[PDB]
């Protein structure tokens, strides 16, 4: 039971840390996608002009 409590604690801590890290990584991916997509939109505007 003590080992299971320790496993629960460490697993919860690692889950929170990994979830936070991957959530922020997915964020950064989202902003990078948005930036490159705005760049593509600007290039399309230049092409249209």
């Amino acid at each position: 039971l003590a080992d299971a409590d320790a496993m629960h604690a460490k697993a919860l801590a690692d889950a929170k840390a990994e979830s936070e890290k991957v959530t922020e990584e997915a964020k950064q991916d989202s902003e990078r996608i948005a930036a490159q997509l705005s760049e593509q939109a600007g290039s399309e505007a230049e092409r249209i002009k």
Binding site: M7, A15, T23, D29, A34
Partner: protein, 60 residues
Amino acid sequence: EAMLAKTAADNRKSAEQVAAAQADYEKEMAEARAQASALRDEARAAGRSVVDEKRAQASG
């Protein structure tokens, strides 16, 4: 007899506790994957809207 019953209950409860801690681990993995997929989806959707309105402005 109470100690024997409590030991059996502790064994079962710790087995289901490790099972549920693991299940919570995959559950939050799936949760994080879902939020990452969302973030990406709405980001690209906003990009679609912005590029479409830029195309409209360029056309006009």
